[PDB]
Amino acid sequence: LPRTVELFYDVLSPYSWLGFEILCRYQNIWNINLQLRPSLITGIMKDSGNKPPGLLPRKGLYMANDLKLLRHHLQIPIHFPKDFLSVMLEKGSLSAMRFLTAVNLEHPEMLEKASRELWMRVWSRNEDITEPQSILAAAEKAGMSAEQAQGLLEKIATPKVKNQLKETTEAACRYGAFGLPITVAHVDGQTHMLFGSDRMELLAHLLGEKWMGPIPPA
Amino acid sequence: LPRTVELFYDVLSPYSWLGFEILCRYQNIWNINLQLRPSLITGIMKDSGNKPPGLLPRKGLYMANDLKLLRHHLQIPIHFPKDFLSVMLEKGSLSAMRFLTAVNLEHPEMLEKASRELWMRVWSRNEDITEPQSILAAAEKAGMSAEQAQGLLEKIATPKVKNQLKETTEAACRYGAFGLPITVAHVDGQTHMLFGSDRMELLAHLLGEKWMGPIPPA
Ligand SMILES: N[C@@H](CCC(=O)N[C@@H](CS(=O)O)C(=O)NCC(=O)O)C(=O)O
Ligand SMILES: N[C@@H](CCC(=O)N[C@@H](CS(=O)O)C(=O)NCC(=O)O)C(=O)O
Structure with a gap:
């Protein structure tokens, strides 16, 4: 069964765009179900006490x-x-x-x-x-x-x-978000939250998939 | 000739350890001259106005x-x-x-x-x-x-x-450090400062080398 991967993002976040493009390139390669979750980084920052x-x-x-x-x-x-x-x-x-x-x-x-x-x-x-x-x-x-x-x-x-929008943003916070983007992988009854567009190789490892760089072939 | 790559680190930094091991695993594979630069993260933090x-x-x-x-x-x-x-x-x-x-x-x-x-x-x-x-x-x-x-x-x-130690730490600050680890690659006249243990794939790209993951063939 395909693993569900949730991506929380805000268009105000340039790094979220980078993570988004990488996952979109792999959505038809890896056995995953990509779910996009539009969120407000401002709400996440306020809730976590973090700042840009x-x-x-x-x-x-x-x-x-x-x-x-x-x-x-x-x-x-x-x-x-x-x-x-x-x-x-x-x-x-x-x-x-x-x-x-x-x-x-x-x-x-x-x-x-x-x-x-x-x-x-x-x-x-x-x-x-x-x-x-x-x-x-x-x-x-x-x-x-x-x-x-x-x-x-x-x-x-x-x-x-x-x-x-408020609920989706609160869900990110409940997963422990302090910024964006965050990716939530649901693997065998286990939930892993990864922060950043630079944790995709680690995501591949957790999914047991092959990392082929930020620009996979075909 | 081999490209000079400087690694600024503090043993107090766990991420610096991860970056260090990755570069050490590649120092005999890639065409680089790895230069270790012992530094004080506390000094970098104070100079940049950053906090742990x-x-x-x-x-x-x-x-x-x-x-x-x-x-x-x-x-x-x-x-x-x-x-x-x-x-x-x-x-x-x-x-x-x-x-x-x-x-x-x-x-x-x-x-x-x-x-x-x-x-x-x-x-x-x-x-x-x-x-x-x-x-x-x-x-x-x-x-x-x-x-x-x-x-x-x-x-x-x-x-x-x-x-x-003070001078090495200051060199990191002059390169723009706000934390550790930072890797400085000297590639054809240009100098690139990369932050984190998670920018090694990007480093390979800048060097024109091949990234084979965090654990390359020994
Ligand atoms: N090294 C990671 C950094 C992500 C980041 O700094 N995200 C900012 C938002 S930015 O896209 O506007 C963020 O939420 N930072 C939180 C923090 O640094 O505490 C990457 O390459 O994706
Ligand atoms: N995502 C990067 C984070 C490096 C980091 O947070 N380094 C801390 C020091 S830690 O090893 O004690 C640091 O200097 N952070 C500066 C900051 O986050 O602004 C990685 O995977 O290496």
Whole structure:
């Protein structure tokens, strides 16, 4: 039976995008059932008493250099902006994550593509992801029709959508999250929580699967 | 010619031990010149304004679980004691790092083994590494004679040894360190600083070498 792997992420998290692309490349290679869980990193940080690593000068500088190298190693078009702290702390990703939650509730088959497009806007093209038109553009590029995207956008402020995002974020905390991304592997009645996009080789080991690098063949 | 790769470490750092063993396993496989750089993590922490991650409850908990899994994946006999905080924040590793600095100055050929034995005491058997007799035990187990070990131990308080440790620690800070371990690769004019024991696959990519996992064919 395929092992269930849960990935908690926020589009505001560049490292979550990296982990997400690696798991998506392996979802049809490894015997796993990938379940995407849109969460709010702000909620996780507040609950754990943690703070964004970029607030400390040297860590912020390191992130920039690290992401620059990972762009080539992982072959993910990430272009980290110099004013990333403003993007993270001043703008945020509330509407975007509420939108992805609505997508997960009514059109889950579109969640992977819709998520990738939002990440592409904020961390690849340095485009806005807080305004309605911005989210609509991302949704349409993901394949949704103007009508579908519009219908979902109208529900981002409904109690059902808000409560679902809150619950998913709380589930991450219950697993012990202090940041994102976190991957939860359910292997033979055992649950393992791994933090970071750099624990995938360890995940392979736990699953008894073969690690073939961040870019597996075929 | 072989590419110079510098590894900055402190025996007080368990992750530094994991990074160290991986590089030691590859030092004769990849075209590199591994340079060990004994450093003080406390000095790096103070200089960067960072704090031990284990101080945050949820992260301290994660570290324990992470190291337990890495133990089997990397095949390193690491046993994280319940009171790791006391060993770190309280006891420290000053004398031990000054000792290794002395070893590096007069018996460089013994640095690798001396370093490993000290890690074995603190992170494997959970034994003391602050008292001279504790350090002597490690040095002798590493292959040094009581005469040699005793000789180096008498120099850990000399200005030459103190300044060398300070300078090496400062070099790590100048490279942008906010913690350990950090690996600095010198590849064709360019200098890349990588943080963590989990960036070794990326290092292989930068060096144009082949990554064969944490345990390459012996
Ligand atoms: N070395 C790991 C780091 C992940 C990370 O720093 N995640 C940030 C969020 S970032 O994507 O905005 C995070 O949640 N950090 C928590 C912490 O560092 O305590 C990796 O390669 O994925
Ligand atoms: N995911 C990396 C973490 C290294 C780490 O947390 N290092 C601590 C010291 S620990 O060995 O005592 C450190 O210096 N952390 C700095 C920070 O987390 O900001 C790995 O797998 O090596």
